[PDB]
């Protein structure tokens, strides 16, 4: 006859909500006695069988720019990073004035000797010690033309908390798992432009392998694409929104260094010892990064022919960074526990006008691109609340046989009748890397209650 309402429990309907998430790590990350920095004592392990079920005919809108897991991941990384430097050595008795000269006979033109006095394990006795501090960690306090007085940089503003020499900065993968009563929708569309509907949504509980790499201006190890180069942006109208280029073919990049002596152990009290840079044996060279020439050339050509779809009659150009200090204009990362800040002058020096150039030469692979750069030791990252460190050095030489995944670009402001616009690389906020690694997923809440029309009559 007429419609009578009936209640249903166990109904698959969805809403958008913001809740905290869990961890998930591999089984090999718990047998290590170095305790890592994230996945040994806090994060829970996962099962070795990630079940994924594809849904039939559902279309769901995705917005990777207005996301909750990016902000939660950033807050969790910041909090877990600040909690891992509390039981470590603090370099408060190192703000004494340093007397610094050239590095012996035949100076290296990059380090200063910087001999000082320090308090030993006895509170009365003091001893004269020496090191080799890097030049960007040395500030010339002066009142006249004095070339022998120097001090450390982090004693001026806030703290000198050294990292512990047991943990490591190795980026092992982690997975984010939704809590009970929540699911994660993942879009499998290959032509996903970042915002809009998706028609191959699959429901998963735990995310795939995410490596929280510390990098700016250029993306390190990460997940590749499937079909072609993908452009990620939210408006593509103004010049103040960072655009992400997601690649398809990796390009090999290595970074090397000359030798050092050892970790010179200097005591500043009971138990608190720090490892400074000792001597340098052998000849001194530069710390450089090598990138293949023809792979970078046809990769940038592929980026050009794919980016020409959004600009039909305009040529693209590249040049240097748009000014600033050391920390923002250089591609910065870390390897083996030592940080690198490297100039990108020889990578973004070119232009594309729409005419493709084919590179067919087998013997031309010998030519490479070299990036010469220096090393810092005190890191002021996260653009605030960073808990200013002092990275301990490594004894021998190191290698950085790495992989490249994406690029971060920013358009410059043009003038009238400017048909040739430029794209300069820039980093800035840390959220861009984890936003590039979390475009697929979206947290979702299920409501098991519902109503439906039928002809059910409850008996009395």
């Amino acid at each position: 006859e007429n419609l009578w309402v009936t209640v249903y429990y166990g109904v698959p309907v969805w809403k958008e909500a913001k809740t905290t998430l869990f961890c998930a790590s591999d089984a090999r990350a718990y047998e290590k006695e170095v305790h890592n920095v994230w996945a040994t004592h806090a994060c829970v392990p996962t099962d070795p069988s990630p079940q994924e079920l594809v849904l039939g005919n559902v279309t769901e809108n995705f917005n990777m720019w207005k996301n909750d897991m990016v902000d939660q991941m950033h807050e969790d990384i910041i909090s877990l990073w600040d909690q891992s430097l509390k039981p470590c050595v603090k370099l408060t008795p190192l703000c004494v004035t340093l007397i610094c000269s050239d590095a012996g006979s035949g100076g290296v033109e990059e380090m200063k000797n910087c001999s000082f006095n320090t308090t030993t394990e006895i509170r009365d006795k003091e001893k004269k010690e020496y090191a080799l501090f890097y030049k960007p960690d040395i500030v010339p306090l002066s009142e006249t033309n004095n070339t022998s007085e120097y001090r450390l940089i982090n004693c001026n503003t806030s703290a000198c908390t050294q990292a512990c020499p047991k943990v490591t900065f190795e980026p092992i993968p982690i997975h984010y798992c939704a809590p009970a009563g929540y699911a994660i929708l993942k879009c499998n569309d290959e032509t996903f432009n970042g915002t809009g509907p998706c028609s191959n949504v699959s429901t998963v509980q735990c995310t795939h392998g995410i490596r929280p790499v510390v990098s700016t201006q250029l993306l390190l190890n990460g997940s590749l694409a499937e079909k072609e180069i993908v452009i990620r942006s939210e408006n593509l109208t103004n010049n103040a929104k960072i655009i992400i280029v997601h690649l398809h073919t990796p390009v090999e990049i290595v970074c090397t260094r000359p030798n050092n002596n050892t970790r010179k152990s200097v005591r500043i009290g009971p138990g608190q010892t720090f490892y400074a840079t000792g001597d340098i044996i052998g000849d001194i060279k530069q710390a450089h990064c090598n990138i293949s020439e023809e792979k970078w050339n046809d990769t940038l050509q592929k980026v050009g022919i794919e980016l020409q779809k959004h600009f039909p009659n305009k040529t693209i150009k590249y040049n240097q960074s748009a000014g600033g200090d050391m920390e923002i204009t250089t591609h910065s990362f870390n390897c083996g526990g030592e940080f690198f800040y490297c100039n990108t002058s020889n990578l973004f020096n070119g232009t594309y006008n729409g005419t493709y150039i084919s590179t067919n030469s087998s013997a031309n692979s010998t030519s490479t691109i070299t990036l010469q750069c220096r090393i810092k030791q005190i890191i002021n990252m996260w653009q605030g609340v960073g808990r200013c460190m002092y990275a301990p050095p490594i004894a021998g030489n190191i290698t950085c046989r790495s992989n490249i995944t994406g690029l971060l670009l920013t358009r410059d402001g043009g003038t009238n009748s400017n048909e040739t616009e430029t794209f300069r690389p820039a980093g800035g906020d840390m959220r861009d890397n984890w936003r590039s690694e979390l475009y697929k997923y979206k947290v979702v809440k299920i409501e098991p209650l519902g109503v439906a029309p039928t002809r059910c009559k409850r008996r009395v």
């Binding site: 079920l53 009563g181 098991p448 409850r458």
Partner: protein
Amino acid sequence: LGFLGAAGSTMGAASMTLTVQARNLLSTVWGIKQLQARVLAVERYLRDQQLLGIWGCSGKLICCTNVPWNSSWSNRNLSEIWDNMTWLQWDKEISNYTQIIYGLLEESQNQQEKNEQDLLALD
């Protein structure tokens, strides 16, 4: 089928799978956050169970209530609802009317229970 096996399937065929989406509602730095989330999940399930039990539909998945359905709410034929539509569009176009439906179910349960105690007391 596990999570959301019939989230876009046939309306008549989505009534055979409510058990698997209802079986799994409970299954220092991070000693408080997961605790708060777990207690929140427990109270979400308990609120759902109490809301089911407040109109006499506890322990039964598909329960029936004698309150009628007004023509100003859906005005659509039953056959193509149960054979063509899905749950998500139904939640899209019914969720603005849910509170008065819940109130009607509560009033109908109150009337049914008051007739039940009147019949028990008069006998």
